[PDB]
Design a protein around this ligand. Structure first.
Ligand SMILES: CNC(=O)c1cccc2cc[nH]c12
Ligand SMILES: [Zn+2]
Ligand SMILES: [Zn+2]
Ligand SMILES: [Zn+2]
Length: 461
């Protein structure tokens, strides 16, 4: 069982208000036929328009919530809402657009999906809370057939043009009018009691219901993300490389060793309390410090209460007041004052970060991590960690042309002694690039208020 069988049953109770008299017994095969799509027995890579919950999770970057509200059935106009906040009105003659015929509506749909998805996925997954009109309207903007490649490149075809009779991916679809071979999934098939708003509002206070189709489309994708990434967590699923994943991850490792090593040199803490990843390793292996590890998986729902991390039942818990605490991506409600902290800012706009549930976001870099909403108050006992570069390594070149470096934040023997050497200038600039890579990727660094880089200069005496 790799794909969803067309002979699987589709619960139709949710479709009987827009479609009165629909059979209770219904397969995907009969539903697709009813929707106007002739699969004509095809073994060419597109076995079903609808996908499994598992296939949907592997393709989370393609998720676009879709809702159609029957505004006034090729007799009345339809309001087409997308989780992008777009509302289009199709006529059969929070961004809201006036009534227009399908021939122009379908052009806008291709433009919008292509701009949204080109840098995220090779496909679209229409996430629905199906009531009837969204499925019966797909024949107006969707064409299906064998799997294909773009006319201008080797990527999988996601759009079709009736004007030129050619196929294109999301990058080369300008002027294309049909969505080609889309995927879709009905959230109602997962067995819910009650309507969309009641199920959504159980877990999210951030998306309201302004009664437009995009509002439902957003709430639908939000509820799907909650079910698949907040309540259900699968860290085994790997996701393709689409951006700066390898550079961002390497930068995080360089930044972590740098910041922790400098803190241990500047304030000579005897013990370090490392909380978070149960698979974490000593980021500064040569440090003198007593390195103690505490297991806490990434919290995907709400941030950990600092108090519950010490709830040791009938035994005494450790005193974190001695030494320093390292919370590298361990999201707590209020950090202790003696901490070094890396906290992902969920508000960041990027191709790695997808909108999440209740203010949080779904960070997808090798794995999907739903992260709780960023909260500035978690850092009240700390300060924003300033940029600095520290190096005790020898001033030795080993060899890109050179411009002399002048910086107050290059903490080296050469800078103390008057002039930065070529090696430390190359290393400072590389470290500044990795630092900016990680900050721009959404990460934020915080440190105990007594942290001072002035204390680092005397480690050369
Ligand atoms: C930081 N957390 C602790 O010191 C600790 C120590 C011993 C048991 C438990 C259970 C939860 N936390 C514990
Ligand atoms: Zn292409
Ligand atoms: Zn929501
Ligand atoms: Zn030097």
């Amino acid at each position: 069982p790799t794909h969803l069988s067309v002979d699987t049953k589709f619960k139709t109770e949710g479709l009987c208000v827009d479609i009165p008299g629909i059979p209770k017994d219904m397969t995907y095969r009969r539903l697709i036929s009813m929707m106007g799509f002739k699969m004509n027995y095809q073994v060419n890579g597109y076995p079903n328009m609808f996908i499994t919950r598992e296939e949907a999770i592997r393709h989370v970057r393609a998720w676009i919530g879709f809702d159609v509200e029957g505004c006034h059935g090729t007799n009345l106009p339809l309001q087409l809402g997308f989780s992008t906040g777009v509302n289009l009105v199709a006529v059969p003659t929070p961004l809201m657009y006036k009534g227009l015929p399908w021939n122009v509506v379908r052009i806008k749909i291709v433009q919008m999906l292509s701009d949204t998805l080109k840098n995220l996925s090779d496909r679209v997954v229409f996430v629905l809370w199906a009531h009837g009109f969204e499925l019966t309207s797909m024949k107006y903007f969707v064409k299906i057939g064998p799997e294909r490649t773009c006319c201008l490149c080797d990527r999988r075809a996601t759009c079709f043009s009736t004007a030129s009779d050619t196929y294109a991916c999301w990058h080369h679809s300008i002027g294309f009018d049909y969505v080609y071979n889309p995927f879709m999934i009905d959230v109602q098939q997962w067995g819910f009691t009650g309507n969309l708003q009641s199920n959504h509002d159980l877990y999210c206070q951030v998306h309201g219901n302004a009664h437009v189709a995009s509002c439902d489309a957003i709430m639908t994708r939000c509820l799907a993300v909650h079910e698949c990434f907040v309540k259900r967590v699968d860290w085994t699923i790997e996701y393709p490389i689409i951006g700066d994943e390898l550079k961002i991850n390497a930068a995080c490792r360089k930044v972590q060793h740098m910041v922790v090593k400098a803190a241990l040199l500047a304030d000579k803490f005897p013990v370090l309390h490392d909380i978070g990843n149960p698979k974490a390793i000593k980021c500064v292996p040569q440090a003198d410090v007593e390195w103690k590890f505490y297991d806490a998986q990434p919290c995907s729902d709400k941030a950990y209460k600092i108090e519950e991390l010490f709830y040791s039942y009938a035994t005494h818990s450790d005193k974190f007041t001695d030494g320093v605490c390292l919370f590298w991506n361990c999201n707590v409600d209020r950090y202790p004052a003696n901490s070094i902290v890396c906290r992902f800012d969920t508000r960041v706009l990027s191709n790695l970060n997808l909108p999440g549930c209740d203010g949080g976001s779904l960070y997808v870099n090798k794995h999907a991590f739903h992260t709780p909403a960023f909260d500035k108050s978690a850092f009240v006992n700390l300060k924003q960690l300033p940029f600095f570069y520290y190096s005790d390594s020898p001033c030795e070149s080993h060899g890109i042309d050179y411009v002399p470096l002048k910086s107050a934040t290059c903490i080296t023997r050469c800078n103390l002694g008057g002039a930065v050497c070529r090696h430390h200038a190359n290393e400072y600039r590389l470290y500044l690039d990795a630092y900016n890579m990680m900050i721009s990727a959404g990460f934020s660094l915080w440190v105990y208020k007594q942290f001072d880089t002035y204390n680092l200069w005397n480690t050369f005496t």
